[PDB]
Design a protein around this ligand. Sequence first.
Ligand SMILES: [Cl-]
Ligand code: NA
Length: 129
Amino acid sequence: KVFGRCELAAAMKRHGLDNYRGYSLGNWVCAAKFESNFNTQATNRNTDGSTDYGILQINSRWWCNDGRTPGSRNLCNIPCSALLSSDITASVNCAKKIVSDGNGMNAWVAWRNRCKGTDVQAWIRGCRL
Ligand SMILES: [Cl-]
Ligand code: NA
């Protein structure tokens, strides 16, 4: 599924991401835009052989099992394919674990480089929430 901007904002709000660990909704929408272009089916392979999955590009090295990343962890206890669903629940629940592990949203490279320190409220402007 390719989400619209306000559609995704509303979905993330319903799932409890607004101000989660102090990160306003606009941060999450900005991260999803630059990680996946709002596409739940996005995948990208990394140099170390791991793969990133879904709307928030969650990495198989640590967070999910895809059966082809040797010696990796599965800290969200899910198959990586669950992260590609049109239902974003699994992605949101795993993201809550990631953002709580000490490094906040710096775990997402696109957030650090393209969202952090910008007017992220612009990403939810005009939306009926
Ligand atoms: Cl933080
Ligand atoms: Na893994």
